[PDB]
Amino acid sequence: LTLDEAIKTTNRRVNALENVVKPRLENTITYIKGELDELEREDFFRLKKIQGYKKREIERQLASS
Amino acid sequence: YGYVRKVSGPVVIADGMNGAAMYELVRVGHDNLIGEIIRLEGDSATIQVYEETAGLMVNDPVLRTHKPLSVELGPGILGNIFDGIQRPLKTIAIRSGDVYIPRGVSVPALDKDTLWEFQPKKIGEGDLLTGGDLYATVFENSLMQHHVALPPDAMGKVTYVAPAGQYSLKDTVLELEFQGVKKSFTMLQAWPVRTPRPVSSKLAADTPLLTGQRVLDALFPSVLGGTCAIPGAFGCGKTVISQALSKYSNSDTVVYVGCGERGNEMAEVLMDFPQLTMTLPDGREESVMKRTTLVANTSNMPVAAREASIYTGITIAEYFRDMGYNVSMMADSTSRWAEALREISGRLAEMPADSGYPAYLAARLASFYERAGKVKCLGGPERTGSVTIVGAVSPPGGDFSDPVTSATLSIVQVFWGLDKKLAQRKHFPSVNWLISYSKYSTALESFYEQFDPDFINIRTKAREVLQREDDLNEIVQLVGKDALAEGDKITLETAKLLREDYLAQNAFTPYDKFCPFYKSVWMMRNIIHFYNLANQAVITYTLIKHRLGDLFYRLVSQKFEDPAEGEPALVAKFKKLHEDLTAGFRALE
Amino acid sequence: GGDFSDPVTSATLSIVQVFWGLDKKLAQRKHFPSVNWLISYSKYSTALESFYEQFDPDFINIRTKAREVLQREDDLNEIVQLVGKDALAEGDKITLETAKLLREDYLAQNAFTPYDKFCPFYKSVWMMRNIIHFYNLANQAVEKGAGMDGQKITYTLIKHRLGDLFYRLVSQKFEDPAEGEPALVAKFKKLHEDLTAGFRALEDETR
Amino acid sequence: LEVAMEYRTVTGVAGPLVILDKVKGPKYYEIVNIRLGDGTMRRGQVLEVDGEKAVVQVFEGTSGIDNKFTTVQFTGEVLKTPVSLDMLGRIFNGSGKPIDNGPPILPEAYLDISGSSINPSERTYPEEMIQTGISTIDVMNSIARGQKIPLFSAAGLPHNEIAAQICRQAGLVKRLEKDNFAIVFAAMGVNMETAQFFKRDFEENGSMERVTLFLNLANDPTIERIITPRIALTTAEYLAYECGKHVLVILTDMSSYADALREVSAAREEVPGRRGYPGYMYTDLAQIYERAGRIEGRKGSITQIPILTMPNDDITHPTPDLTGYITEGQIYIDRQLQNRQIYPPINVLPSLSRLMKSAIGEGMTRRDHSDVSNQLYANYAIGKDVQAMKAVVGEEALSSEDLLYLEFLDKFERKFVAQGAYDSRNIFQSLDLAWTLLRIFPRELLHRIPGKTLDQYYSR
Amino acid sequence: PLFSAAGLPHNEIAAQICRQAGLVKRLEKDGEEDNFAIVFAAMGVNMETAQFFKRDFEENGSMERVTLFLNLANDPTIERIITPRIALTTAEYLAYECGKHVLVILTDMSSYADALREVSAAREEVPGRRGYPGYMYTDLAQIYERAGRIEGRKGSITQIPILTMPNDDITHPTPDLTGYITEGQIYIDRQLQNRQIYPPINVLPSLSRLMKSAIGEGMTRRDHSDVSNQLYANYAIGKDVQAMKAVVGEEALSSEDLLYLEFLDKFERKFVAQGAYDSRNIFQSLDLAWTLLRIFPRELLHRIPGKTLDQYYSR
Amino acid sequence: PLFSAAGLPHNEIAAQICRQAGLVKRGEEDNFAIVFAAMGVNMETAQFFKRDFEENGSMERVTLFLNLANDPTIERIITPRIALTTAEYLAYECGKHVLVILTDMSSYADALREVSAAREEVPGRRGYPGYMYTDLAQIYERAGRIEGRKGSI
Amino acid sequence: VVPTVTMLGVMKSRLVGATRGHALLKKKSDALTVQFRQILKNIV
C-alpha cells in the first residue's frame, strides 16, 4: 500500500507537475524577452529616428538660409 | 587619398571617397588600420574598423584597396598559421620578434620571396586554355603535391608558358591573351571570402568519410562532401574527433577553423597539431602539418575577424577542392561565431530577432553550410573533389533550443551527438547512440551494398538491437532481469556486448587507435550473426549463458585484435571466432 | 513586491553594507518586525567583534548556533512539504521546536507594549543564550539515549514532563525592561539555572 | 616638442559631456585637462570627434563649467600609464596617482593601456600549480599558472574576505619541488568601508614587496572605474613579460566594471544592447581577460582570478553567462554555506576547473592529487545523497556505509572547508588533511583510488 | 483605491459604499455637514455603468446631494485627463471653503493612464515602463494627494479611486504607482468571483496604512486590532495548510489543519459574504469575527492578548 | 497546409502526393496541373525533387519554381508570387485545375522577417513584421473557385 | 500567471524544488520497493 501511494505521487510529480511548470517557465521567458525587450529596442529606435529627423530638418533649414 | 571626418568608436566616416564600393576593405590612418565599408551615404563613406581605433587623427589619410575581404591563395597556404583576416601569425612573430601582434601589421599572407619548385604541364606556348585549367603543379613539400589551376574568370589562347625550374610567387609564371590584349598571371590567386568558388556541377555524395572510429564509421556514417554537427562543450571529444580526422580520415587535406574560443584552448590545440603525426599506407612517416592548414581567431581578436574566420576557412577549403582534392573543414565553435555575429549586429543596431540574434543568422548559417558537397571541377583535365564540414555546436547547457542549435540541426544532414553522460561513465568514443543519426545512409547504401550487401542488413539489425536496448533497460528497471525471457536475455546480453566491445573504442590503446572499415564490418558480422544464431534456438537462458561464457570473453578478445597484423589477418581471426561461435550455437542446439 | 533585479535595488545592494530585507510573506502572516532572516545580511559582523567580545565573550557562538538552527529549519521545510514530519528524527524535531520558539519569541516584537517597545541588548542576548542553551541541552539529552529509548521519546518527555520550562522560555519576551537590568538579569539567570536542572533531572531516571 | 593648443571654445555642456567648437585636428581618444573659471583643474577624455568638434567626457563631474570662462587644454596622448619595477608595494588610486603618502612613479617606460594582443602562435599551455592556501581551491578545484578562473559571488556574500585571503596567502607550490611572484590587486567600485579593510590588509600584510593595490572607490568618477582594471592589467603585463616574473591578478567586482561600461556607452547616445548591457561588453571582457596566458618566449605568466558578482543569485544574468564562455572555470560562493557559518562558503561540489588536470601531476604538486580530489568529490556527493535520504527514511534503516558517509560529510564541512581567515595551509598539509578524512573508509571502499596509492598513504 | 480586474463588480461595491458610508463614533453618528456630499467622477465608462450609477444615486434619495462629472468612452479621450482634476477642485471648494465632509469616487484610473499614454505618444516623448510617460508618477501624485483633513477648516476630503488592472496583475505601472502613492489597497480577486461571493474582496492582499489610527478604544472595541491580526494570520496559515493538503491529501492533514480548513470555509462563506443591500454594524461585525475565531482553542489564539480574551473568549 | 517539424518526411509526403495526384474520377486535358513552389530548399532536396518528378512521368503537367537557400533572401519572397500567378493563369484563364504546392513556408516567413528587419519596420510577435497576416493572406488567400470559370486552385 | 522577472524566478525555484522532491520521492519509493521484495521473498 505504501509503495503504491509513493509511486502514484512520484508519477504525478514527474508527469503532471514538472511538465506543467516547464511550459509556464517557457511562456514567462517568451513574454518578457520576446515582447518587452523587443519593444524597448523599438521604442528607442523610433526615438533615435525622431532625433535624426530633427537634426536633418535643422540642417536643411540652415542650408536654405 | 581620403581623410577621416568622424571617429565614434569602431564606426568611422571618411570623406572624399565617391568612387568607393560597398563592402570594400580599406586602409585607415597611418597605422594602416583595416576596416570594411558599410554605408556610402553622400560623397562620404562609412567604415567600421576591426582593430581598436583609439588614437586616430582627423584628416589622417585613408587608402582604398579596390577589393572586398579576400584571401590570397596559392603555394605555401598549407602548414602555416593564419588569423581571421588572413594574417600569417608565424611570419609576423618572426619578423616583429616580439610576441604581441602589432596594431597595423602589413605582412603579406604568404611569403612572396620564398622559392618553390615549379614545372608546367605538357601544354604548348600557343594552345588554348580556359578558367580552371590545370596548367602546372608544384611540390610545395613532400607528399603534398600542389596543382596550379588557372584562375576562374580568366581565359584565352596561350602566349607564354614558364619552363620548369625554381621560381617565386612574384615571378610571372604565365601570360596569355584572350583578345588582342594580353594578361600575365602569377602563382597567387585572390578571391573574396563571401563569394563562393565557381563550380561546374554539384555531384551526389557517394563515398563515406572513414574517420577511423567504428562508432562514426558504421553506426552513423558520414559521406564525403557532407555536413556534420557535434555538440562539443566538454569531454575533449571534439579534440579527439579532430585528431582522428587529421590523422586517419580519407581527406587529402584538413583546414581547422577556430573562432572566438578560449585563448589557452587554441594554444593547446595549435601545439597539439604539430605533435600529431600520421604514418603513410606505404610505410612512410609524415607530419600532419604538411597537409594541415589552421585558421585560429581567439577572443582577443577583433570581432569582425572572428566572424570572417569561418568564411576564410571555407574559401580555403574550396580552393583546395578546386584541384580535386578531398578536404575537410572543422569549425571549432559555431556558437562563438554566432555570438560574434550578434555583437556585430548590436554594433549596427539591427532589429533584434529571436533570443537576440539578428534575423539573418539562420540564413547566413545555411548559406555557409550549403558550400559543402562533392563537386565536379571547373576546367580540364576532368577530376572531382569534395568539401565536407564537420562544424561543431555548443548549445547552452545542452538545451538544443537556441536558434544556432536549431538552425544547425535543420541544415546539417548528420549529427553525431557526443554525450557528457558517456564521458562520465568513461566512454572513449562518447557518441550517444540514442540521439545520433545519419540522414545520408540512404544515399550511401549504394556503396554500403557494393562493399557488402549484408552490411546494410547488419546495420538495420544493430539499430533494432539498440532500440530494444532501452526497452530492456526499463524492463530491468521496473521488474528486473528475472522477467526477461531467454530470447530477451540473449538480446540484452548481445546489446551489452555490442555497447562494451564494438560500439565503444579504446583510442589510447595501440590496437584500437584506428579501426579499419574491414575490421568494423567483420566485427559487426561476428556480433549480429552470433546474436541471431543464439536467438532462433529459443534453450534455457542460463544454460545458453554457461555454454557461451567462453565465447563472451572471446568476443572482447576479438575487439582486442591489433590492426598491425593487417586487415585480412584480423578479419580471419574475427571470422574464426565467429565460425567457432556459430558452430557452438548450432551443434549444441 | 519586486525582486532584487530592480535597478534601484541592485544599485543599493552593490553599495549598502547592511540589508534589512523585509519580506511581504511575513507581513501577510502579521509578523510585525517582518525582517526575512534568510535574505538579510550585515557585512559589519566582523568589525563588531571587539564590542561583542567585551560585552559577552560567548555571544558570537550562540548567534552562530541560532543562525545554523534557522538555516537547518528553512532547509528541511522543503522536505517536510513533501514527506511530512513522520520521518523527522529526534534532532530534527528538537531543531524545529527551537526554531519555532525562536521565531515566535525572539524574532517577533509588538512594539506597541512595554514588553517589546524597546528591548535592550542585555535582554536580547539573554533570550538568545537561554534558547541556545535549551537547544544544546535537549540535543545532548536526546543523543544520550538513556532508558533504551532516548531520542524522540526523550523529546516528548521534555516537551510534556518538562514543558513548564518551555512555557517560561516562550514567555521570557514579557520581562518588563522597566524592572531594570539587575532584576531581569537575575530572572534570566534563574531561568537558566532551572533549564540546567532540566535535561539533568530528566536524565536522572534515564528518561 | 609641440605645445598643445589650449582651446577656449566650449559650445555646449550636458551631463558629463562638453562639446568643443573648433578644435584643430583632434585625436579620437585624446586626453585633455580643463581649467575652470574658478581655477580648479579637471581631466577629461575625448570621445567621438567630428569636423572641428570633439565631445569630451569629464572626470569628477561637470559642475561649475561655463561656456565663457573654461579652457580645455589638449595634450595629444592616449593615457600612457607610467610603469616601472618600483611600482610594487604601493597603493594607487583609480587613475594611478599614488595615495600611499609616497612619490609619483618614476617610469622605466610609458606603456599605452589596452595593449596589443598576444599572437596565438606564441602562447603555451599553462603548467604548474599556484598555491592559494585555501584547501577547497588547491585540492578539488586546483589552479594552474595561466588560467583565467572566475570567482562568482553575490551581493552580501563575503567576496572581499576571500579576496584578501588570496592576496595574502598566495604562493608558489614548487617550494618542496626543489621568489618571482607578484600580485597586482585591482578593486573596482568598492564600498567606502571595504576601502579601510583593503588599506589595513595591504598595510600590515607582511609581504608588501609583492602586491600593488590599484584602488577605485564607488564615489570615484566612473571613467576611473573603467580605466582601473586596464591600468592593473597593463602593469601586470609589464611585470610578467617585460620583467620575467610570475604574476597573479585579482579583479574585484567586474560587474561594477560592466555597469561602468554601460554608463559610458549610454552617454555616447548609443542604443543599449541585450538586457541593457551593451553588445560590445563581450568584446570588452574578452579584451580584459585574454591578456593572460603563458608566453613561450618569456619565463613569466599571468593568472587571473576575476571576482564577479552575479545579481539575483543566478547565473542567467548577462555578465556571468557571458564570462562563462570566455573563461575555463567557476568557483561559486554559496549563500547557504554562509548561512551555515562556514567561513569559506565555496560550494566545492558545484565548483570545478575546466583544466584542473594540468595542476595535478608528478613533477609539480604530489602524485596522489587527482585520486584524492576525485575520491573527495564522489564521497561528498554520496554524503549529500545519504543526508537527503536520512531526511526521509528515518535514518534507522541506513546501513553502516551510510553512517560513514554522513560522518564524513559532517567532518568535511566542519573541519576541512571551514578554514580560518588566517590559517595558511600548504598543499602538502592540505592533502594530509584530505587523507585524514579519507582513511575513515576501508582501504577497499575507496573505489576511485588507483592501486599503489592506497598502499602508500592509507597506512598513515 | 479599490483594485479590480475587468468583469468584477467594482462599480457595484463602489455604489454600495456610496449608499452605506457613515460615521461610527460611539454609534451616535440631521448631519447635513456630516452628509458626505459625494462627488462622483467617471472616466471612460460604458454607458451602462453611467446609467447604473445615475439610477442608484437617484433611488437612494441622494440626488440632492451627489454630483456627477461624466466622461463616457464615446466622449473625447482628452477630457478624461481633465475630468478628475475638475472633480477634485470641486471637492476642495465644497469641503475646505464650505465645511462639508466630501467623498470622491474616481472611476477607472486606467482610463486616465490611457489618456496620459495617448498624450505622451502624440508628443514623441521618451517612454517609461510599458511605454507609459516617465512622469506618470507625478501626475498620479498630483491627482491623489489632494485629499485629507486640514487643521484650519472643519471640512475633509476622502477619495476612493477604483482601478482596473489590465491583465489582472499588480506589476503594471499604473496600479504599481497607485499602490506607491495611496495609503491603501483593497483587492478584488477573480478566484472569489469564480466561487460566487458577491463581495470578492480578498482580505489577505488588502492593506490600510491609517488602520491603526481609525480604530481604538475611544471609537471601537478594544479588541479590534487583535481580532483583525488573528483572523488575518489564521486565514493566511490556513491557506498554506490547504495548499499543502492539495498535494498530501485530505487524510494527511492534522487536527489543527482541519480546524484551519473549517475556519477558511466559514470565513469565506459566512464572514466575507454580505448582502447587496444589507449593512453590518461594526460591533455586529466584530461579534461575527469573534464567532469565527472561537473555533480554535485559547492556546492557538497567539496574537490575541489574554486581557482581551477574558472579556471576549466566552461572551 | 501540412504541419510538420524539421527532419520529418513531409517532403517525401509532398512528393508522393504530387506524383499520385489525380481527380476522384467518379478529363486528362483539364486534369491536375501541379505548380510546385520551393522556397528555401536544400540542394539535395532540390535534386531529389527534380529526380522524383522526372521519374513519375508527370513532367508533362508539373511546373517547378525552385529557389535554393543559396539564392538571395529577397528573391525568395517573389517565388510564391510568381508560382501563384502562373497558377492563376493556368486555372482561371486556361481551365485546368491547379494543385499549388509550396514547401518550407517557414523559409518564406524567415525571408519576410529578414526583409522587414532590414527596413526596420514595426515588429509583431517573435520579431516578425506586423503585416505578416496580410502577406500570408496575399499568398494563401487565392485558392478557390470562380463562378464564371471552370478552373479551380 | 502574470509574467514578470520575479515571477520567472519564482517559477524557476518551484521547478528546481519539484525536481529535488521528485528525486527524494523516487529514492524513498525504491527503498520501499526493496523492502517489499525482501518481505515477499521471506513470505515465499
CSV table of N, CA, C and O in Angstrom, one decimal, chain D residues 90-147:
chain,number,residue,atom,x,y,z
D,90,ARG,N,53.0,49.5,-3.3
D,90,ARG,CA,52.4,50.8,-3.0
D,90,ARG,C,50.9,50.7,-3.5
D,90,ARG,O,50.6,50.0,-4.4
D,91,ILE,N,50.1,51.5,-2.8
D,91,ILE,CA,48.7,51.6,-3.1
D,91,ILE,C,48.5,52.8,-4.0
D,91,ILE,O,49.1,53.8,-3.8
D,92,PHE,N,47.7,52.6,-5.1
D,92,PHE,CA,47.4,53.6,-6.1
D,92,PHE,C,45.9,53.9,-6.2
D,92,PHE,O,45.1,53.0,-6.0
D,93,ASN,N,45.6,55.1,-6.6
D,93,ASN,CA,44.2,55.5,-6.8
D,93,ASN,C,43.7,54.8,-8.1
D,93,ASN,O,44.4,54.0,-8.7
D,94,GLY,N,42.4,55.2,-8.4
D,94,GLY,CA,41.8,54.6,-9.6
D,94,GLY,C,42.6,55.0,-10.9
D,94,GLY,O,42.7,54.2,-11.8
D,95,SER,N,43.0,56.2,-11.0
D,95,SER,CA,43.6,56.7,-12.1
D,95,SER,C,45.2,56.6,-12.1
D,95,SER,O,45.8,57.0,-13.1
D,96,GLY,N,45.7,56.0,-11.1
D,96,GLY,CA,47.1,55.8,-11.0
D,96,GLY,C,47.9,56.7,-10.1
D,96,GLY,O,49.1,56.4,-9.8
D,97,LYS,N,47.3,57.8,-9.7
D,97,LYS,CA,48.0,58.7,-8.8
D,97,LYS,C,48.2,58.1,-7.4
D,97,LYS,O,47.3,57.6,-6.8
D,98,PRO,N,49.5,58.0,-6.9
D,98,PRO,CA,49.7,57.2,-5.7
D,98,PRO,C,49.0,57.9,-4.5
D,98,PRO,O,48.9,59.2,-4.4
D,99,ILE,N,48.5,57.1,-3.6
D,99,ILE,CA,47.8,57.6,-2.4
D,99,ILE,C,48.4,57.0,-1.2
D,99,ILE,O,47.8,57.0,-0.1
D,100,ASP,N,49.6,56.4,-1.3
D,100,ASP,CA,50.3,55.8,-0.2
D,100,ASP,C,51.2,56.7,0.5
D,100,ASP,O,52.2,56.3,1.1
D,101,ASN,N,51.0,58.0,0.4
D,101,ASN,CA,51.8,59.1,1.0
D,101,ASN,C,53.3,59.0,0.5
D,101,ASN,O,54.2,59.3,1.2
D,102,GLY,N,53.4,58.6,-0.8
D,102,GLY,CA,54.7,58.4,-1.4
D,102,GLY,C,54.8,59.3,-2.6
D,102,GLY,O,54.0,60.1,-2.9
D,103,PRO,N,55.9,59.1,-3.3
D,103,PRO,CA,56.2,59.9,-4.5
D,103,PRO,C,55.5,59.3,-5.7
D,103,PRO,O,55.2,58.1,-5.8
D,104,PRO,N,55.3,60.1,-6.8
D,104,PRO,CA,54.8,59.6,-8.0
D,104,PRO,C,55.9,58.6,-8.7
D,104,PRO,O,57.1,58.8,-8.4
D,105,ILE,N,55.4,57.7,-9.5
D,105,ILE,CA,56.3,56.7,-10.0
D,105,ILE,C,57.2,57.3,-11.0
D,105,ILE,O,56.8,58.1,-11.9
D,106,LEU,N,58.5,57.0,-10.9
D,106,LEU,CA,59.5,57.4,-11.9
D,106,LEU,C,59.5,56.3,-12.9
D,106,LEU,O,60.0,55.2,-12.6
D,107,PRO,N,59.1,56.5,-14.1
D,107,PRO,CA,58.8,55.4,-15.0
D,107,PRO,C,60.0,54.9,-15.8
D,107,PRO,O,60.9,55.7,-16.3
D,108,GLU,N,60.2,53.6,-16.0
D,108,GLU,CA,61.1,53.0,-16.9
D,108,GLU,C,60.5,52.9,-18.3
D,108,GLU,O,61.3,52.6,-19.2
D,109,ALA,N,59.2,53.2,-18.5
D,109,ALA,CA,58.6,53.2,-19.8
D,109,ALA,C,57.2,53.7,-19.6
D,109,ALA,O,56.6,53.8,-18.5
D,110,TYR,N,56.6,54.2,-20.7
D,110,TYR,CA,55.3,54.8,-20.7
D,110,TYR,C,54.4,53.9,-21.6
D,110,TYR,O,54.3,54.1,-22.8
D,111,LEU,N,53.9,52.8,-21.1
D,111,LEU,CA,53.2,51.8,-21.9
D,111,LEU,C,51.7,52.3,-22.0
D,111,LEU,O,51.0,52.6,-21.1
D,112,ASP,N,51.2,52.3,-23.3
D,112,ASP,CA,49.9,52.6,-23.5
D,112,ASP,C,49.0,51.5,-23.0
D,112,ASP,O,49.2,50.3,-23.3
D,113,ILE,N,47.9,51.8,-22.3
D,113,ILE,CA,47.0,50.8,-21.8
D,113,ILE,C,46.2,50.3,-23.0
D,113,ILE,O,46.2,50.8,-24.1
D,114,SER,N,45.5,49.2,-22.7
D,114,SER,CA,44.8,48.4,-23.7
D,114,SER,C,45.9,47.9,-24.7
D,114,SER,O,45.8,48.2,-25.9
D,115,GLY,N,46.9,47.1,-24.2
D,115,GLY,CA,48.0,46.7,-25.0
D,115,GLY,C,47.6,45.7,-26.1
D,115,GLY,O,46.5,45.1,-26.0
D,116,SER,N,48.4,45.6,-27.1
D,116,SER,CA,48.2,44.7,-28.2
D,116,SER,C,48.1,43.2,-27.8
D,116,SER,O,48.8,42.8,-26.8
D,117,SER,N,47.3,42.4,-28.5
D,117,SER,CA,47.0,41.1,-28.1
D,117,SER,C,48.2,40.2,-28.4
D,117,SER,O,49.1,40.5,-29.2
D,118,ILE,N,48.3,39.1,-27.6
D,118,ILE,CA,49.3,38.0,-27.8
D,118,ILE,C,49.1,37.3,-29.1
D,118,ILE,O,47.9,37.0,-29.4
D,119,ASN,N,50.1,37.0,-29.9
D,119,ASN,CA,50.0,36.1,-31.0
D,119,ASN,C,49.6,34.7,-30.6
D,119,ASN,O,50.4,34.1,-29.8
D,120,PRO,N,48.5,34.2,-31.1
D,120,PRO,CA,48.1,32.8,-30.6
D,120,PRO,C,49.1,31.8,-30.9
D,120,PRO,O,49.1,30.7,-30.3
D,121,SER,N,50.0,32.0,-31.9
D,121,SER,CA,51.1,31.1,-32.2
D,121,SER,C,52.1,31.0,-31.1
D,121,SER,O,52.7,30.0,-30.8
D,122,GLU,N,52.2,32.2,-30.3
D,122,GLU,CA,53.2,32.3,-29.3
D,122,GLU,C,52.8,31.8,-27.9
D,122,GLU,O,53.6,31.8,-27.0
D,123,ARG,N,51.5,31.5,-27.8
D,123,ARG,CA,51.0,31.0,-26.5
D,123,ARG,C,51.5,29.6,-26.2
D,123,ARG,O,52.0,28.9,-27.1
D,124,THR,N,51.4,29.2,-24.9
D,124,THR,CA,51.8,27.9,-24.5
D,124,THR,C,50.9,27.4,-23.4
D,124,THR,O,50.4,28.2,-22.6
D,125,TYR,N,50.7,26.1,-23.3
D,125,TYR,CA,49.7,25.6,-22.4
D,125,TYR,C,50.2,25.9,-20.9
D,125,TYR,O,51.3,25.8,-20.6
D,126,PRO,N,49.2,26.2,-20.1
D,126,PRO,CA,49.6,26.5,-18.7
D,126,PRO,C,50.0,25.3,-17.9
D,126,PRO,O,49.6,24.2,-18.2
D,127,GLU,N,51.0,25.5,-17.0
D,127,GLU,CA,51.5,24.4,-16.2
D,127,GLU,C,51.9,24.8,-14.8
D,127,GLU,O,51.9,26.0,-14.6
D,128,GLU,N,52.1,23.8,-14.0
D,128,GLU,CA,52.4,24.1,-12.5
D,128,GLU,C,51.2,24.7,-11.8
D,128,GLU,O,50.4,25.4,-12.4
D,129,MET,N,51.2,24.4,-10.5
D,129,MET,CA,50.1,24.9,-9.7
D,129,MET,C,50.5,26.2,-9.0
D,129,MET,O,51.7,26.6,-8.9
D,130,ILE,N,49.5,27.0,-8.5
D,130,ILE,CA,49.7,28.2,-7.8
D,130,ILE,C,49.0,28.1,-6.5
D,130,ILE,O,47.7,28.2,-6.4
D,131,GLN,N,49.8,28.0,-5.4
D,131,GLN,CA,49.2,27.7,-4.1
D,131,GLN,C,48.5,29.0,-3.6
D,131,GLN,O,49.0,30.1,-3.7
D,132,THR,N,47.2,28.8,-3.1
D,132,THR,CA,46.4,29.9,-2.6
D,132,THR,C,46.2,29.8,-1.1
D,132,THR,O,45.8,30.8,-0.5
D,133,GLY,N,46.4,28.6,-0.5
D,133,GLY,CA,46.3,28.5,1.0
D,133,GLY,C,44.9,28.0,1.4
D,133,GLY,O,44.7,27.6,2.5
D,134,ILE,N,43.9,28.1,0.5
D,134,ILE,CA,42.6,27.6,0.8
D,134,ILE,C,42.4,26.2,0.3
D,134,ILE,O,42.6,25.9,-0.9
D,135,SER,N,42.0,25.3,1.2
D,135,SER,CA,42.0,23.9,0.9
D,135,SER,C,41.0,23.6,-0.2
D,135,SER,O,41.3,22.7,-1.1
D,136,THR,N,39.9,24.2,-0.2
D,136,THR,CA,38.8,23.9,-1.2
D,136,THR,C,39.3,24.3,-2.6
D,136,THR,O,38.8,23.7,-3.6
D,137,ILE,N,40.2,25.2,-2.7
D,137,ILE,CA,40.7,25.6,-4.0
D,137,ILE,C,41.8,24.7,-4.5
D,137,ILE,O,41.8,24.2,-5.6
D,138,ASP,N,42.8,24.4,-3.6
D,138,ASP,CA,44.0,23.7,-4.0
D,138,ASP,C,43.9,22.2,-4.0
D,138,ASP,O,44.8,21.5,-4.4
D,139,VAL,N,42.7,21.7,-3.6
D,139,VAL,CA,42.6,20.2,-3.6
D,139,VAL,C,41.6,19.8,-4.7
D,139,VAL,O,42.0,19.0,-5.6
D,140,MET,N,40.4,20.2,-4.6
D,140,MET,CA,39.3,19.8,-5.5
D,140,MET,C,39.1,20.6,-6.8
D,140,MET,O,38.6,20.1,-7.8
D,141,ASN,N,39.6,21.8,-6.8
D,141,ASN,CA,39.4,22.8,-7.9
D,141,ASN,C,40.7,23.4,-8.2
D,141,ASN,O,40.8,24.7,-8.3
D,142,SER,N,41.8,22.6,-8.4
D,142,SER,CA,43.2,23.1,-8.5
D,142,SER,C,43.3,24.2,-9.5
D,142,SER,O,42.5,24.3,-10.5
D,143,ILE,N,44.3,25.1,-9.3
D,143,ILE,CA,44.5,26.3,-10.1
D,143,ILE,C,45.9,26.2,-10.7
D,143,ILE,O,46.9,25.8,-10.0
D,144,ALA,N,46.1,26.5,-12.0
D,144,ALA,CA,47.4,26.4,-12.7
D,144,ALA,C,47.8,27.8,-13.2
D,144,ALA,O,46.9,28.6,-13.6
D,145,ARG,N,49.1,28.1,-13.1
D,145,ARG,CA,49.6,29.3,-13.6
D,145,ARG,C,49.3,29.5,-15.1
D,145,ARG,O,49.8,28.8,-15.9
D,146,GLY,N,48.4,30.5,-15.4
D,146,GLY,CA,48.0,30.7,-16.7
D,146,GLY,C,46.5,30.6,-16.9
D,146,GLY,O,46.0,31.0,-18.0
D,147,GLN,N,45.7,30.1,-16.0
D,147,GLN,CA,44.3,30.0,-16.1
D,147,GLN,C,43.6,31.4,-16.0
D,147,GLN,O,44.2,32.4,-15.5
